[PDB]
Amino acid sequence: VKDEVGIRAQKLFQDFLEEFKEDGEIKYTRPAASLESPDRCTLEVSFEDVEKYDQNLATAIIEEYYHIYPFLCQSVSNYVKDRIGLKTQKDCYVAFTEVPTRHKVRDLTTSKIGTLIRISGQVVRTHPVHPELVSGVFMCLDCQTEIRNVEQQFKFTNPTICRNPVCSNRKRFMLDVEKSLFLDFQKIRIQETQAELPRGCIPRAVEIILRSELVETVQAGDRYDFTGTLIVVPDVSVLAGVGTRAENSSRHKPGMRELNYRMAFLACSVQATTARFGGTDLPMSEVTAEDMKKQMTDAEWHKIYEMSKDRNLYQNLISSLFPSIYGNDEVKRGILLQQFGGVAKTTTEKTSLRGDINVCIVGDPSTAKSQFLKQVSDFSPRAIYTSGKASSAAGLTAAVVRDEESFDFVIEAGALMLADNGICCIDEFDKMDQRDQVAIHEAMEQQTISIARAGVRATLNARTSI
Amino acid sequence: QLVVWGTNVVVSQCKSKFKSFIMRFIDPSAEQDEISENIDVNQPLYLQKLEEIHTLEEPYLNLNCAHLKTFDQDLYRQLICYPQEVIPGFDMAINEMFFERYPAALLEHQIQVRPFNADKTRNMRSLNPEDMDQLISISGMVIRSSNVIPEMREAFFSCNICSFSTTVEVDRGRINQPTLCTNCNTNHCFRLIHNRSEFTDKQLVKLQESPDDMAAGQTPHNVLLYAHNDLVDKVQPGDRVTVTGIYRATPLKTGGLSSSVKSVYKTHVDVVHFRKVDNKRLYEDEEGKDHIFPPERVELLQLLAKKPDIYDRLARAIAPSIYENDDIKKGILLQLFGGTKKKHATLGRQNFRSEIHLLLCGDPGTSKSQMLQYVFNLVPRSQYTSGRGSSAVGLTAYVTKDPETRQLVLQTGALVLADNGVCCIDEFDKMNDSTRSVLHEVMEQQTLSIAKAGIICQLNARTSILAAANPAESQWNKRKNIIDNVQLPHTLLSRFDLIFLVLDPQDEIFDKRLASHLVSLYYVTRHEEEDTMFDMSVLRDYIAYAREHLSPTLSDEAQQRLIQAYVDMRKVGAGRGQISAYPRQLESLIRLSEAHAKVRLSNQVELLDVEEAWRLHREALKQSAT
DNA sequence: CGATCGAT
DNA sequence: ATCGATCGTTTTTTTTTTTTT
Ligand SMILES: Nc1ncnc2c1ncn2[C@@H]1O[C@H](COP(=O)(O)OP(=O)(O)O)[C@@H](O)[C@H]1O
Ligand SMILES: Nc1ncnc2c1ncn2[C@@H]1O[C@H](COP(=O)(O)OP(=O)(O)O)[C@@H](O)[C@H]1O
User: Keywords for this entry (chain B)?
Assistant: First the structure.
């Protein structure tokens, strides 16, 4: 058998990181240790570390991956067995990283298969969860049906010959959805790189699939880093492929399916970068590893006490975010209170009580009232800005449709409307038409709003200030 | 005594005669034929080219049959009728030619052979039965660039007992198997899997016939082609390209529920070779790596920089022949040398690009549309749209169905392809308010954040203007300034940096000079490299190279003049319904300044740029003293 | 064009 | 078990009216 070298390779990789892996420590045992209780079966592995200890299995890896891939799961099980009293429930999801090379939609051939390469793009026209019971139990009809075998191939075939008997070899048993092997994925599409925008041809799009742990964490407007698992796609039927056709005409001595395969692509790693914020228990650049209410929520108390104690820090902070700016010193102290919290009471079922406050700017022309806020989109989280006429009243509403795509009437979102606990300010409040204006007339105060003419029980809500 | 069944060929004849022909070769196809010429090579071009290519070690030759005319055309004809039987022998001759070149060379990376040049057949319209296995070559216009597809010749196999894990490939369409693969005793049945096996790429695209070689007043009936590995996406759409191939006929399946077969064989051409035809006259694209210049050109570039005449030279080299009142072409040239890069990777704050924004506006007399139709044949990111060519969504979100996915997709735009570029634009006062409230967003923030039911985006978009706006009038009305003549608001009209005004030249006289000279320009249909020394490309890298290695910096020079004179520059508070001076002007002044220091390549500040800036201003800021 | 089904 | 004679087998379309904002 071919990949027994890969077996021993990741075996003794385990056996090394069974000892230390990094400075008397291991980076992929405590993830596995957290795994041991629920047994969720996802562990990313550094690709650098193959070159560290295994001495360039990368080229042993990055071509015959698709065939080698399954053996990594057996390797995973062999890892978990060594110290845990183990059953073979264990599985292998991977979310690979620490990989250098970054190729795009153009270097595509028959020669690109079984790799781990990292690739980006865009996210469009997403699509939902759609499960899969890939496996089950199936053989002849009478008694000899206990079948946890390898029957989980994409091309699925109930028909199996026999295990114990001479019995039916096309008449199958019935099915198992109870104690067998199942899993999940979804399916979405991707457009050409906006970092690679040439002329001429279209945005050639790729098909894409996601395993368990990858799921519902892709999203429109985001670039990525995939695996390089380009496929032979177990397709079923297609037209225009009028090449030569073949099939095994067996030995002469004294079923058919037309063959035209198409392409798609699969991936088992993501770093949805440019879309990552982190609240306060994330250790930042400047921290103080201390004890606190939570991990890093205020473990820099060692200074934040000081930044909460001075009678000077009021004015200093008023001057600690307008270094490049000079004007009055009243909005320079008031505007932060818009970003600063409100009331946050703990009280009755009377009605929603609000924390936020309305806020304004007026001024004569060319006073850099814009530059106050041009940065604020770059500043706060949740709080991205554009203008109101920067879109239509498909800013407040969605784009009103009168053609059939899914159920022929869709207004279920907007542009103001997705600013939950961030502000999406606007400019030019004087010449804008009196539609969103009277919408805001109550949408700011009574943050619980409705529409008609296309309503799926229309009840939406504003959340922030202005 | 050996030849294929339905043929009259023999392979040793063709290979031997081609080998003798290349040996009987001193580049005679243009050293004996073009004997007036003499390539200084009294050696075959072919062993010379195996040297040129194995010294380069970048394989994949090409041939042409004009070389192969002078030899006995028995090779030529029996390559015509049997090209699938005579082509690869040329590659075998190449295989021995390696040995002629080098014995131990890379004798495993293989060479193409791409002949052509018998003649145009005629054109697509007029074909016959007999031209089915022959040599054809026409061209026209392109439709598409479609996606690529593998194609097998083999499978992968498996087993249960001892793991008979094997393969076997295809001849073309007929395969064998035991009850196993590598069968011994038949311990199981045959296991076949379909992935870990042999594949080949190829792809098909559709192609037209549309030069003016038309059945005139007829739509061009179009052709079709496949592709093969080394010719796959050899061309992108909207090109005219030559074809070299062999006609290829194919049945159609009657019905489909059964295996019946229809009378009409469909025909296409296979692929040997094509001729991608390039026409990029204007100032070329922006890869950066594939454009680097030599030091010898840097000599001439800094030579150009060594002229104080350079302040006017390139502005004078803007027009091909136009010699009236170019006094703005200096103001053009600050965008020719398209702006400075005052980056904001420094503080993370306030992101003030050296935004350069100027438009031309005036009467119809000025050749704004035609000048700038030619300047479309200058600008690297040349665009040309205008009022009522495309809507706001005609600039962005070209969203609709895609039968490639069998689904609809979120899709394309216009401006984000033209970052840093220009679109020559006219008829500005033509659009709905839907557009032109986008331009406020970009002209004032140079941004975009988008929200639709599908994808929601915060992209990046940013570039500089050219435009050729017009009024609601035919002539700019005397005693009614463009302060209101062109159709815009009260101080948004004032908002622009400065639009260097245009208008008809109010002087009857000067018509005759150029009505005669620049008609004689046509009458001769050529130019002269007079004092207007039109550089072939010596102008074009001072354009190109001077976007990148330059970083204007301010020490003390080009700032302080209006930093004094702002007293009366902001005594402007007085005025009834007017528009006046504002403290955005100097931003534009610094930007102009670093721009004009781009010319002269002054890494530190230029001071004269202020003086031409003040000139630029007060030549066209006193157009409304009223 | 496929599976059923009968006998040799 | 083997062969042969038995059984049963079918798929193709694009566009016009009133309605709602
Ligand atoms: N105190 C200041 N700090 C920084 N920039 C300023 C200040 N005062 C004025 N400016 C400049 O003045 C310009 C004001 O233009 P802006 O007010 O945005 O135009 P509008 O009046 O149309 O909003 C800005 O570009 C800004 O850089
Ligand atoms: N210097 C020049 N060189 C060549 N053509 C000129 C020149 N000056 C004027 N023209 C002519 O004037 C006409 C200008 O019309 P055009 O600019 O296209 O109208 P609009 O101003 O609406 O764009 C063109 O047809 C052009 O041939």
Answer: ATP-binding, DNA replication, DNA-binding, Helicase, Hydrolase, Nucleotide-binding, Nucleus, Phosphoprotein
B177 inside 8 A of chain A by CB? yes
Q: Pocket residues for ligand 2 (CB within 6 Å)?
A: B 322, 324, 364, 366-370, 426, 468
Residue A150 to residue A181: CA distance in whole angstroms? 10
The tokens describing A155, both together, are 């091309």
Residue B242, SS3 per DSSP: strand
Among candidates A393, A383, A412, which has minimal Cα distance to B453? Answer: A412
From the CA of B265 to the C1' of D15: give the distance in Å.
33
Measured CA to CA, the distance from residue A150 to residue A135 in angstroms comes to 8
* Cβ contact A453 with chain D strand, < 7 A: yes
In this structure, is the CB of residue B258 within 7 Å of any atom belonging to strand C? Answer: yes
Distance between CA atoms of A426 and A431, rounded to whole angstroms? 13
**A333/A315 Cα distance (integer angstroms):** 8
In angstroms, rounded to a whole number, what is the distance separating the alpha carbons of residues A55 and A48?
10
Residue A413 CA to residue A415 CA, distance in Å, equals 7
CA of A369 to the centre of ligand 1 (A): 7
User: Of the candidates B355, B376, B483, B373, which has an alpha carbon nearest to the alpha carbon of residue B420?
Assistant: B355
Q: Is the dihedral of CA B125, B131, B136, B141 positive or negative?
A: positive
Of the candidates A67, A390, A398, the beta carbon closest to that of B196 is on A67
Other CB atoms closer than 10 Å to residue B586's CB: what's the count?
17
Q: Is B411 on the interface with A (CB under 8 A)?
A: yes
Contacts of A258 by beta carbon, 8 Å cutoff, 6+ apart: A237, A241, A245
CA closest to C1 C1', residue: B258
CA distance B127 to chain A (A): 23
Q: Do B410 and A370 touch (CB under 8 A)?
A: no
**Contact criterion met (CB below 8 Å) for B453 and B410:** no
Taking the centre of ligand 2 as the mean of its atom positions, its distance from the CA of residue B473, in whole angstroms, is 17
DSSP B317-380: TSSSS--S--TTHHHHHHHHTT-------SSSS-----------B--SSS-HHHHHHHHHTT-T
Q: What's the sign of the alpha-carbon dihedral A218, A224, A226, A230?
A: positive
CB B110 within 8 A of CB B101: no
Kind of pairing between the strands at B167-169 and B247-250: unpaired
- What letter represents residue B526's amino acid? R
B626's CB contacts (< 8 A; 6+ apart) are: B481
Token couple for B368: 């704004």
Angstrom distance (rounded) from CA B369 to CA B427: 9
CA–centroid distance, B424 to ligand 2, in Å, is 14
Question: Residue A161 to residues A145, A299, B186, B189, B441: CA-CA distances in angstroms?
Answer: 12, 65, 14, 10, 69
Angstrom resolution of this structure: 4.0
d(CA A358, CA A464): 9
- Any atom of strand C under 7 A from CB of B259? yes
Which chain A residues contact residue B148 at CB under 8 A? Answer: 108-109, 263
Rounded CA-CA distance B317/B315 in Å is 5
Phi, psi of B130 (to 5 degrees): -65, -20
Q: How big is chain A by its Cα radius of gyration, in Å?
A: 30
The dihedral sign for the CA sequence A320, A321, A325, A331: negative
Cα R_g (chain B), whole angstroms: 33
Cβ neighbours, 10 Å, residue B425: 22
Nearest to B444 by CA among B488, B496, B483: B496
How far: A461 CA to D19 C1' (Å)? 31
What residue owns the CA closest to ligand 1's atom 10? A368
